[PDB]
């Protein structure tokens, strides 16, 4: 209701994770960046570490389904909407490793989209959404660009239901 | 050169790989359950992967499928004393329900005839691909992916070894 900023919902989000998901405070995830359209995750390396001291893919996974998830929360709370969130599909394909600090880019879904979803909620207390999301190693990246090409890629469904 | 490593043997390997080697299954709880060569069923309890509704939350579902399917590609590789790099190269996950206590991550050995060509490309190449399924059931008695329970969770995942 007071939260509508984008400082003021990503503490919200913050909040959230810290309360509800301990898997997200092993792994060291906080919000990078969020400006109403682009939410940037991140998690250190090492306790995200596989045995070739590159990133876990299950963490990579993790990131990235955190994202989407988190976008779609976001909105929500801009939204003033109460209701449950559930992922219902995450998709991954791992490209390359990643060596470093991982950092999940989602950009948010358009206006319409979101309208329409909102709009399907609205009447039916029920509504699906999908997104994307992207880790890059290389690359110090702050938009999913066309021409960079991932590390790993995310795509998953989204649902929100009524109280 | 050594002889093949009974299911017994190699099991021991992967716990003690997932130990030395990852730390998300330590804070996880993640355990192997069984493993006789033809399933390999992982173990979590619910505490450590939990979500705001009390139930599994799906990226701990995700860890534990893509866990259990990896786990099964290095036992076999294992158990043939193969040298290798495994990495995963896709993993796909539906959810269909909640899993509300003990998450148990159910995965079978691909096909005899599938384990040989993966490893004879990788004999001739130095990589090899191949896929696997896994499922995550809320019964506590289901020991196989069957048809006749529905599962929770399905999972379809695909690895690589590479030599080194």
Same mark, same amino acid.
């Given at each position: 209701n007071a939260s509508l900023?984008?400082?003021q919902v990503s503490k919200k989000l913050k909040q959230f994770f810290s309360d509800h998901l301990p898997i997200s405070q092993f792994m060291g995830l906080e919000?990078?960046?969020y400006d109403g359209d682009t939410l940037i995750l991140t998690a250190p390396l090492e306790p995200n570490i596989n045995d070739k001291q590159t990133a876990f893919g299950g963490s990579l996974y993790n990131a990235a389904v955190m994202a989407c998830?988190?976008?779609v929360y976001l909105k929500t709370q /801009? %939204?003033?909407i109460a209701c449950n969130q559930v992922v219902?599909?995450?998709n991954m394909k791992y490209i390359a490793p990643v060596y470093g600090?991982?950092?999940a880019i989602c950009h948010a879904p358009? /206006? %319409?989209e979101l309208a329409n979803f909102f709009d399907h909620f609205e009447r039916k207390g029920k509504a699906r959404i999908s997104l994307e999301a992207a880790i890059y190693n290389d690359a110090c990246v702050m938009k999913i660009e066309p021409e960079t090409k991932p590390s790993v890629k995310f795509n998953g469904q989204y649902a929100?239901?009524?109280n």
């Open positions: 900023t984008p400082d919000i990078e960046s998830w988190g976008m /801009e %939204e003033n219902t599909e995450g600090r991982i950092r358009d /206006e %319409e929100i239901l009524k």
